[PDB]
RNA sequence: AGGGGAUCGAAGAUGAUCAGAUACCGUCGUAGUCUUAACCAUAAACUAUGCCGACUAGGGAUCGGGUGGUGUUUUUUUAAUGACCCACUCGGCACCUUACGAGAAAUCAAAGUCUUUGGGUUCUGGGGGGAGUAUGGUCGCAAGGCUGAAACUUAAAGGAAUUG
């Protein structure tokens, strides 16, 4: 039967969502069906900045940050220790871990 | 499948059964008297009421 | 009707107000609660103090009608009710159950804590939902202290109050035993203030 | 409205609707098409007479292993060929 | 493994419930009570009984342990239960009320001292 | 089997029949 | 119910919910019998005499056993305007 | 759209009786509504009911009580003959000692028994029991 | 001996409550079966069928048998109890106990012309239990129980003399065909007839009138 | 049929992989992907829920419009505005809780108001296959679409849940 109510995605009242491509395998997954994981990171690290710290003009300059938005697919997400799998009772929880 | 086979062994066991003939026995009553006879052995007779009122249990 | 002596006297109206009993819940409301009145800004409701008075005497009237004192049962699982439940039950039969409710205390006759109450009292329906449950399974009435967010489901006559209040829970328990004893005959003088202080039925952290 | 029309003057719809769906039945299909007349080697009859042509060694379906000893018969009234079983223990000897 | 079993958890718990004014926090004295105050079929159990007894008796020294109530323990709870201050905390220390309770009492028709201080958004 | 390529087998089949049929016509 | 000549039949004339006026089946365990004492001019209860109220399991399942008694009691006079007819 | 005001009215009456209420609002209160309820109240199933007169079509507020079991409409309104009254009362009544089949005749609206007392027939409107 | 532990079992042992009629009037739950066989000594047990049900395991299947048992005296009362156990003999005893504990009253009326000693049901009654619907239309005199043989016994044991029946769904898997009639034959005291409209003084429950006998 | 032909890319050439590999993977690669003009009429074209109308439980969020409020901010501290806040409302895409209700369960405020069986109306189905085949029409340039059987065959796959 229906495994779930939305049942793949957030498409409710559209029909079409103009899909996107997976970051790992380029699969043409629907955008609202995608598994968006915003990646935010420092430009270098939080541990190796010590070595770079003494080798910089402009003391404590910015330590800029790196941003990303990753679109995985169901096959790619499940395979790599991502949202992979839950219990039937816990699939209702829509809050992030 | 196949439509050929061993037709030469038709009637194997029927023609192989040893011939035992019917023993001579007294006639049973016909018509009303049979209902008289059957009523007697079933209802007013308690011959086979072993656990469940069997009619023809095997000899034991 | 009433002899006008059961009417709420001013010397008890300030106690309800000193315990903040009139303080209701947030803007969140249960439609099964018509006791709300004159909400403040910043989302504060207030319970009509007149209503909770005769709602209180009604509960005692049912309690007094039960012949055997020990057929009354009071249920406490919330933190703010363990001392209140035992103090009320010390002055009446009203046999108390506190701590763990061990579900199956009404059904399952072979359980150690088998009880057949003629009427139960629960402090908070949400925290005592299990106690409310079997009372709907073996034909038992329920008396509950209820705020404006209370689940009035499977609950007989309820007391509009502030279960959040620290003294509101205790005072309503106190006025519960006070009015039960008066009807039974322990307190012949209605005007007598029942010298036992209402501060007795409270909760202490140490 | 449960589907089907309920108007007091919709008997025409109901009768014609029933006619179209009656065809999904199997007995109503064969009866009105007259398939048994046009097919089913008899003529809609229960018995037919024919000439034995040969004997057959038909083998049993699962799960069963045996030979059934049937005969090919060509019918008299229409000339059609059928296969017929010879039921009893050893009765293939009488239908040579 | 050194996790004690039910027959050690329950026999020990049965002792403090009944031998609180009794055998102390020292093992070698406790085990010389158990061998005569209780019929234990095996020495190894008796040694483990006075073991978990000492462990629990060492807990009752600093604060109480929940799950154990010996009748001498709860006098703190049938004396603190009647603990009442003469200050009568429910009395008046000077009562404040918002404008909602101002006309609320007037609707009820009661004469109460109302030092009204407004609290609004 | 799967219905796409049993449906596809039949179309290559129907193509075959119209081809041999039209030779008689 | 009754036969041709008196002789009452149909044992177990059941009770009625005081609010919905429906009847209470034997297996209706979610139903409640409410006895409320009456006190006259003394403030002390009179044991044995009641103002009886019966509620079906239907209203208790819907959480209006409290509300129904608010109107029920007020109509008998043992409450006050706590229930208002106009809404 | 709305085809039968009686179907909408009686459905509202049942759904209030199913939920335990004592009142229901009826819109838009045709003539055959009052005649249907007037029969109903003569048998004690409903009791007091009130006509709110808006200038559009009218409204009806009914005061209910737990006596009623079901009150519906049979659509379409078949012509029933004096001999066919038996079939209707056997199919759609719980028993033959109580319940009434409301059917319109040339002599106004009446139950299946008043039709027999008057020996008149007509079209069928509904049923209450 | 019984030595009951229940408020009702104490009264019933004390003989203070004489008939089940008082039990049904105030909807009193019944917990132990001694209350039934001493207040209604005329109930006869009838085992309908025994069917095995198997659980799948690591290795093999373990087998337990279902035991439907219908009880009731032929005047006014019927009970249906279904219980499964390892052995058929044990399952029969346990299903008997549940059957007695499940006893419900019945309403018997007339098809019309109430001569006396009601022969049929008062109203049309329906009980749906899963796919199956079981309808019980009251019948005229001499019609008997027009019903399937397994259902027929359940209506014989409840004192119904004339009735009609109509079914739907699979009747031929009887565990809940007998629960569809039990609902229907128990819904007899749920339908409000015009001869019950009158308002009663709400008799006080025996637990409150006779509370002086409480064990502690 | 042109224009375009940067990307990717059914066929194919290779390199792999392999026992085989005419597959998955790697490097290329034409028709197409793009467009104008004209055909094609299909999709798991899915909410696998036809449309219209009625009544039946609570809760918050949001979009568009509106209503009221000495509410807040910015302008000219100060007006109007605009943007926010609170309460309510009409319409809409949805979500949360529970079952008095339904269902075969999964579940469902609709899949409820159905043996207590009737608001109006359209379309479709009658064991699984043979078979969307055969045949005859019809539309299309074609691919195919629409319509659509029978003879014959035979007790044998799941909607749903349970235990392993
Ligand atoms: Mg689409
Ligand atoms: Mg018509
Ligand atoms: Mg059938
Ligand atoms: Mg299609
Ligand atoms: Mg579709
Ligand atoms: Mg709709
Ligand atoms: Mg909205
Ligand atoms: Mg929208
Ligand atoms: Mg069919
Ligand atoms: Mg078919
Ligand atoms: Mg088979
Ligand atoms: Mg399955």
Numbering used by the authors:
A (entry chain Da): 2 to 98
B (entry chain De): 2 to 61
C (entry chain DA): 2 to 207
D (entry chain DX): 2 to 97
E (entry chain DR): 2 to 95, 100 to 126
F (entry chain Em): 1 to 25
G (entry chain DV): 1 to 87
H (entry chain DW): 2 to 130
Paper lines:
Such persistent stalling events result in the collision of trailing ribosomes with the stalled ribosome, thereby creating composite interfaces which are then recognized by cells as a proxy for translational stress. Along the trajectory of the swiveling motion, RACK1/Asc1 of the lead ribosome would clash with RACK1/Asc1 of the trailing ribosome. This results in a net movement of the trailing ribosome in the direction of the 60S subunit of the lead ribosome, with a primary impact on the contact of the 40S-body to the stalled 60S of the disome. Yet, since the mRNA connecting the collided ribosomes must be already under tension, as indicated by the incomplete tRNA translocation of the trailing ribosomes, we predict that any additional force application, extending the mRNA by only a few nucleotides, should have an immediate destabilizing effect.
A central event is therefore the splitting of collided ribosomes by the ribosome quality control trigger complex, RQT, by an unknown mechanism. The RQT complex of yeast is composed of the ATP-dependent Ski2-like RNA helicase Slh1 (Rqt2), the ubiquitin-binding CUE domain containing protein Cue3 (Rqt3) and the zinc-finger containing protein Rqt4.
